[PDB]
Amino acid sequence: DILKANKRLADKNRKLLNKHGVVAFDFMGAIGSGKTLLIEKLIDNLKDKYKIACIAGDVIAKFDAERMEKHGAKVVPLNTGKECHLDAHLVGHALEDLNLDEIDLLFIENVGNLICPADFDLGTHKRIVVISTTEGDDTIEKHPGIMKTADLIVINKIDLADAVGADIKKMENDAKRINPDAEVVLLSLKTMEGFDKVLEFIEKSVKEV
Amino acid sequence: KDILKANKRLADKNRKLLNKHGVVAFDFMGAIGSGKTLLIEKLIDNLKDKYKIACIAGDVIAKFDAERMEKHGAKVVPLNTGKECHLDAHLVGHALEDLNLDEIDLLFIENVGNLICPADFDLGTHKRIVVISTTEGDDTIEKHPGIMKTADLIVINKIDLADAVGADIKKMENDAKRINPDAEVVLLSLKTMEGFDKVLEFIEKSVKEVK
Ligand SMILES: Nc1nc2c(ncn2[C@@H]2O[C@H](COP(=O)(O)OP(=O)(O)OP(O)(O)=S)[C@@H](O)[C@H]2O)c(=O)[nH]1
Ligand SMILES: Nc1nc2c(ncn2[C@@H]2O[C@H](COP(=O)(O)OP(=O)(O)OP(O)(O)=S)[C@@H](O)[C@H]2O)c(=O)[nH]1
Ligand SMILES: [Mg+2]
Ligand SMILES: [Mg+2]
Ligand SMILES: [Zn+2]
Ligand SMILES: [Zn+2]
């Protein structure tokens, strides 16, 4: 079984991160939802207080790895080929290329996709799902599985909602109905509205481990 | 894994069945929310006077898009795709059993929203259309060259929103042409309808060129 084998490696990964005092976050989303830009902003705001590392996973991982690196983060690129999602196996090897005693926060950018990364625990402490208004306001209700795995649901690009005809209150209500336990934040990474709430989720999650 | 060899056999059988009944089929792929359904809706509205049109709508919860296509006057077979990140020829083959192919001229299949998995899975269609949009970012085409190479038409949709996301549409258009020199590349807005003429052109040309 592939799912049993993943959970095994996820717990192993999580055990290793805890040993070295690292708090890890899994950033999932659709394609272009805003994962990298969110991580970029988080690095800029948190790097004074925390030592931050990133794992950037995509077909061509260099695009986002380089985007993260310039913000002052240690970054491990992971070329994911035709895989729909990152897994605890690939993440485990990425952790071997990190000095976890010189790192406090780990931001993992998962492959852009709303089906597959649901079911694949990477060994992180929290999971963030970033969707955007430009995907249409049915995007949350159309993908309940992944939404239920989220600790934070980010509804990004609120500044473009009217232009696509997206109802952001519908999206907010959909997220809360499908996952009552998750935090839900309305965000624009352009205007920065709602960014303080995402930052707060990160900071609290770290202190709660 | 022998998955792709078995799929190809079924895809060829699907194409033969479609050709037998004079149906031209189109596989609509893309990212999440790129505009596949809205494009299909617009195509139905503008071609239904000339062609009898059927759709296959595949997604986790297929009803959302099936219901949209239904109100535009197409016969729709919904496919609830579960955790699968692509449709395949097998499921499409069985969907074809629910259609009267002697009363259909065009088949529009909306694949699941994913730029990775559908690349390797031929559905048994005549043409493949990849819809991406400016709001996903202007690196989207060069970040996923695999699926782009499988496209006969590449649609760069939501051009009306490019400035608001900082996307360079000229860059994206060049990315698409360079990665797939054989594909048609269309800049589109389904809001203003600019570029729609070129999509219709592709559909009609494809129909005329079959076999
Ligand atoms: N207008 C506006 N644009 C945004 C917002 N958030 C992200 N974007 C834009 O969306 C595009 C995609 O953002 P990006 O950060 O690259 O997404 P991503 O999820 O990481 O994309 P991926 O390829 O790895 S799957 C970029 O052009 C970025 O500027 C927002 O809140 N408002
Ligand atoms: N402004 C603008 N909005 C568009 C354009 N094309 C589509 N949209 C909007 O984008 C959103 C997504 O469109 P939709 O047709 O549902 O995408 P889809 O690709 O079929 O989405 P999916 O859930 O099946 S994966 C909708 O809100 C729609 O109104 C466009 O060209 N310009
Ligand atoms: Mg990214
Ligand atoms: Mg759709
Ligand atoms: Zn290994
Ligand atoms: Zn069968």
UniProtKB/Swiss-Prot annotation, chain B:
* Positions annotated to bind Zn(2+) 1: 85-86, 117
Q: Which residues form a coiled coil?
A: none
Extract the Pfam families matched here.
cobW
Fetch the InterPro entries from UniProt. Answer: CobW/HypB/UreG_nucleotide-bd, Hyd_mat_HypB, P-loop_NTPase
* Gene Ontology molecular functions: GTP binding; GTPase activity; nickel cation binding; zinc ion binding
Biological process per Gene Ontology, one example term? protein maturation
Q: Where does Zn(2+) 2 bind?
A: 90, 94
Disulfide bonding pattern of the chain: none
List ligand-binding residues for Ni(2+).
85-86, 117
Alphabetical UniProt keywords: GTP-binding, Hydrolase, Metal-binding, Nickel, Nucleotide-binding, Zinc
**Renumbered residue ranges of the record's region G-domain:** 25-186
> What does the UniProt record say this protein does?
Involved in the maturation of [NiFe] hydrogenases. Required for nickel insertion into the metal center of the hydrogenase. Exhibits a low intrinsic GTPase activity, which is essential for nickel insertion.
Self-association state and partner proteins as the record states: Homodimer.
Q: What family does this belong to?
A: Belongs to the SIMIBI class G3E GTPase family. HypB/HupM subfamily.
NCBIfam families linked = hypB (TIGR00073)
Can you name this protein?
Answer: Probable hydrogenase maturation factor HypB
- Read off the lineage from the record: Archaea, Methanobacteriati, Methanobacteriota, Methanomada group, Methanococci
The gene coding this protein: hypB
